[PDB]
Design a protein around this motif. Structure first.
Motif, short mmCIF file in Angstrom:
data_model
loop_
_atom_site.label_atom_id
_atom_site.label_comp_id
_atom_site.label_asym_id
_atom_site.label_seq_id
_atom_site.Cartn_x
_atom_site.Cartn_y
_atom_site.Cartn_z
N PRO A 148 -1.45 -10.63 4.90
CA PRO A 148 -0.65 -10.30 3.87
C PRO A 148 -0.94 -11.30 2.47
CG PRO A 148 1.01 -10.54 5.61
CD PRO A 148 -0.38 -10.92 6.04
N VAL A 149 -0.99 -10.52 1.41
CA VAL A 149 -1.43 -11.16 -0.07
C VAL A 149 -0.44 -11.72 -0.84
CG1 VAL A 149 -2.57 -10.73 -2.28
CG2 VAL A 149 -3.43 -9.63 0.01
N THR A 150 -0.23 -12.99 -0.94
CA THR A 150 0.92 -14.11 -1.59
C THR A 150 0.34 -14.24 -3.09
OG1 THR A 150 -0.02 -15.80 -0.69
CG2 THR A 150 1.72 -14.63 0.52
N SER A 151 -1.02 -13.91 -3.51
CA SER A 151 -1.54 -14.71 -4.62
C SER A 151 -2.05 -13.84 -5.67
CB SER A 151 -2.12 -16.03 -4.34
OG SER A 151 -2.93 -16.37 -5.63
N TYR A 152 -1.96 -13.95 -6.78
CA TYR A 152 -2.65 -13.32 -7.91
C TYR A 152 -3.98 -13.53 -7.80
CZ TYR A 152 -3.35 -11.43 -12.75
OH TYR A 152 -4.06 -10.59 -13.62
N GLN A 153 -4.70 -14.67 -7.67
CA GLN A 153 -5.99 -15.23 -7.49
C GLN A 153 -6.33 -14.90 -6.12
N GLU A 154 -5.52 -14.64 -5.25
CA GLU A 154 -6.09 -14.06 -3.90
C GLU A 154 -6.37 -12.71 -4.03
OE1 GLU A 154 -2.64 -13.60 -1.41
OE2 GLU A 154 -3.85 -13.76 0.55
N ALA A 155 -5.16 -12.11 -4.75
CA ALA A 155 -5.51 -10.57 -4.85
C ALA A 155 -6.78 -10.17 -5.73
CB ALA A 155 -4.38 -10.12 -5.94
N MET A 163 -4.61 -3.71 -10.95
CA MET A 163 -4.13 -3.78 -9.36
C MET A 163 -3.22 -5.14 -9.04
SD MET A 163 -4.40 -0.91 -7.94
CE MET A 163 -3.95 -1.70 -6.63
N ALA A 164 -3.94 -6.12 -9.48
CA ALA A 164 -3.32 -7.49 -9.24
C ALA A 164 -1.96 -7.56 -9.76
CB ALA A 164 -4.35 -8.38 -9.84
N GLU A 165 -1.86 -7.43 -11.16
CA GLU A 165 -0.40 -7.11 -11.81
C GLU A 165 0.54 -6.43 -10.95
OE1 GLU A 165 -1.75 -5.47 -15.62
OE2 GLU A 165 -2.60 -7.44 -16.19
N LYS A 166 0.13 -5.36 -10.23
CA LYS A 166 0.93 -4.38 -9.74
C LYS A 166 1.35 -5.17 -8.28
CE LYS A 166 -0.02 0.20 -11.54
NZ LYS A 166 -0.99 -0.42 -12.50
N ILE A 167 0.61 -5.97 -7.54
CA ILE A 167 0.67 -6.59 -6.43
C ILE A 167 2.07 -7.58 -6.49
CG2 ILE A 167 -0.35 -7.96 -4.73
CD1 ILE A 167 -1.58 -5.35 -4.70
N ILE A 168 1.65 -8.59 -7.95
CA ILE A 168 2.48 -9.58 -8.09
C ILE A 168 3.77 -8.76 -8.59
N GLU A 169 4.02 -7.82 -9.11
CA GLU A 169 5.24 -7.22 -9.40
C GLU A 169 6.16 -6.74 -8.43
OE1 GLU A 169 4.90 -3.72 -12.26
OE2 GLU A 169 7.25 -3.48 -12.22
N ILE A 170 5.51 -5.96 -7.53
CA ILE A 170 6.01 -5.55 -5.90
C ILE A 170 6.52 -6.78 -5.11
CG2 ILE A 170 5.74 -4.54 -3.84
CD1 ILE A 170 3.50 -2.75 -5.13
N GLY A 211 10.10 -6.23 -5.31
CA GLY A 211 10.15 -5.45 -4.20
C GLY A 211 10.20 -3.98 -4.66
N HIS A 212 9.57 -3.71 -6.17
CA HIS A 212 9.68 -2.32 -6.69
C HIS A 212 8.71 -2.30 -7.54
CE1 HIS A 212 13.91 -1.35 -5.32
NE2 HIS A 212 14.05 -2.68 -5.28
N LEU A 213 8.20 -1.07 -7.77
CA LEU A 213 7.31 -0.73 -9.08
C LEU A 213 7.69 0.10 -9.98
CD1 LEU A 213 4.27 -1.46 -9.33
CD2 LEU A 213 3.81 0.68 -7.92
N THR A 227 0.81 -1.12 0.15
CA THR A 227 0.03 0.03 -0.03
C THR A 227 0.81 1.34 0.07
OG1 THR A 227 -0.25 0.15 2.36
CG2 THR A 227 -1.83 -1.26 1.22
N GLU A 228 2.14 1.35 0.66
CA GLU A 228 2.94 2.42 0.71
C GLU A 228 3.23 3.02 -0.66
N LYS A 229 3.55 1.81 -1.78
CA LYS A 229 3.91 2.23 -3.05
C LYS A 229 2.77 2.67 -3.80
CE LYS A 229 7.91 -1.03 -3.03
N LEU A 230 1.43 1.94 -3.64
CA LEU A 230 0.27 2.43 -4.27
C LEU A 230 -0.08 3.90 -4.01
CD1 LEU A 230 -1.84 -1.00 -4.13
CD2 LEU A 230 -0.41 0.04 -6.23
#
Ligand SMILES: Nc1ncnc2c1ncn2[C@H]1C[C@H](O)[C@@H](COP(=O)(O)CP(=O)(O)OP(=O)(O)O)O1
Ligand SMILES: [Cl-]
Ligand SMILES: [Mg+2]
Ligand SMILES: [Mn+2]
Ligand code: NA
Ligand code: NA
Length: 315
Positions: free
Chosen positions: A41-48, A58-65, A69-71, A6-9
């Motif tokens: 904590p969200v570990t998964s694309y399908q969880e996201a 948004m999910a794609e950005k979760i997976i990238e981070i 560890g970056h965006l 969320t801090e990056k978002l």
DNA sequence: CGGCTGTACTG
DNA sequence: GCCG
DNA sequence: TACTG
DNA sequence: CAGTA
């Protein structure tokens, strides 16, 4: 609070917001809240994608981070953004004003102070730039509310005075004090302000309307800061809708108003109305009719909702 | 496709 | 940006 | 006093 | 913040 994706978002949300893309910023706002209140904590694309408010982008950005560890987006954010944010933190200046100043070559508050043509609000905003960004302790909000209450009481009219906003929601710190004043349904506003100004308590006026006052006050003694004060005066007949509105939070008010709309109703600081007529854009055609709402509970009931105490409205 | 709250104040 |  | 509206 | 208990 298990997700510092969320801090990056939040960085992107503010960037979109100050650059004027309001709805994309809204999308990020909602996504950020969803992640904030998610139990784990969200570990998964399908969880996201399971979370409401989190779509494919948004999910794609979760997976990238998670992966890097970056965006990648954060790096390409416009260099104008930190300056736009500085400027839009002046009370009375928003995205359009911050962008105009930036286009014109302004880069600092020093530039604004010397070369910019400020409205009266913005000039006051600038003079109190730091103070307007600070939150006060709950106890200081109490002292400010009590100051307004005493002034109101001294008129021996039917005046009731209630502190709303984050104060009434029980927060430990407050960005300002929001005070609701009601008079019997039967110039009061102006006399009251004159009282508070005569005491040396009110130091600047941002807005003075028939219904709302926004301004700046300061309590006596050393170590005191200028604090923002909002005061609204409504007829007793509108008390419950005004208390509901002014108590908030803003997000809560927007959700409740959205629900009312799906039900063919309309909620504002004035009234809850039913049989409201809207067009294809959801814009109000005709006003329907006002429902009686003697207490806050009645509004929830008429909406088919369980009551929520102010403490439970902080959304 | 297009809504995402509904109001008040300013100049 | 998301979702109806 | 502790709470509602 | 005037009213309720
Ligand atoms: N955009 C909006 N749409 C609908 N209603 C809105 C609103 N913004 C504020 N409100 C309503 C509810 C707030 O609690 C209340 C006060 O608005 P506010 O600007 O004082 C924010 P508050 O919730 O008091 O926290 P704090 O930062 O001041 O400590 O006015
Ligand atoms: Cl409103
Ligand atoms: Mg407030
Ligand atoms: Mn306020
Ligand atoms: Na989802
Ligand atoms: Na501003």
């Amino acid at each position: 609070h298990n997700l510092h994706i969320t801090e990056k978002l939040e960085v992107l949300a503010k960037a979109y917001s100050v650059q004027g893309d309001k709805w994309r910023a809204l999308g990020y706002a909602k996504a950020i809240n969803a992640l904030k209140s998610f139990h784990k904590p969200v570990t998964s694309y399908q969880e996201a994608c399971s979370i409401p408010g989190i779509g494919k982008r948004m999910a794609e950005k979760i997976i990238e981070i998670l992966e890097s560890g970056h965006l990648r987006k954060l790096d390409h954010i416009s260099e104008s953004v930190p300056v736009l944010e500085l400027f839009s933190n002046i009370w009375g200046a928003g995205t359009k004003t911050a962008q105009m100043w930036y286009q014109q070559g302004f880069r600092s508050l020093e530039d604004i102070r010397s070369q910019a043509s400020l409205t009266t609000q913005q000039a006051i905003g600038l003079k109190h730039y730091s103070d307007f960004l600070e939150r006060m302790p709950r106890e200081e909000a109490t002292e400010i509310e009590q100051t307004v209450q005493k002034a109101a009481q001294a008129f021996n009219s039917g005046l009731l005075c209630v502190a709303c906003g984050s104060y009434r929601r029980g927060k430990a710190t407050c960005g300002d004090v929001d005070v609701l004043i009601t008079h019997p349904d039967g110039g009061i506003f102006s006399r009251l302000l004159d009282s508070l100004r005569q005491e040396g308590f009110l130091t600047d006026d941002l807005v003075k309307g028939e219904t709302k006052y926004l301004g700046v006050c300061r309590l006596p003694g050393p170590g005191r800061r200028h604090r923002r004060l909002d005061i609204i005066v409504v007829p007793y007949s509108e008390f419950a809708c005004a208390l509901l509105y002014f108590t908030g939070s803003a997000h809560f008010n927007r959700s409740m108003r959205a629900l009312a709309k799906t039900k063919g109703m309309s909620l504002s600081e004035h009234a809850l109305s039913t049989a409201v007529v809207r067009n294809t854009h959801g814009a109000k055609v005709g006003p329907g009719r006002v429902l009686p709402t003697p207490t806050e509970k009645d509004v929830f009931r008429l909406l088919g909702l369980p009551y929520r105490e102010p403490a439970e409205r902080d959304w």
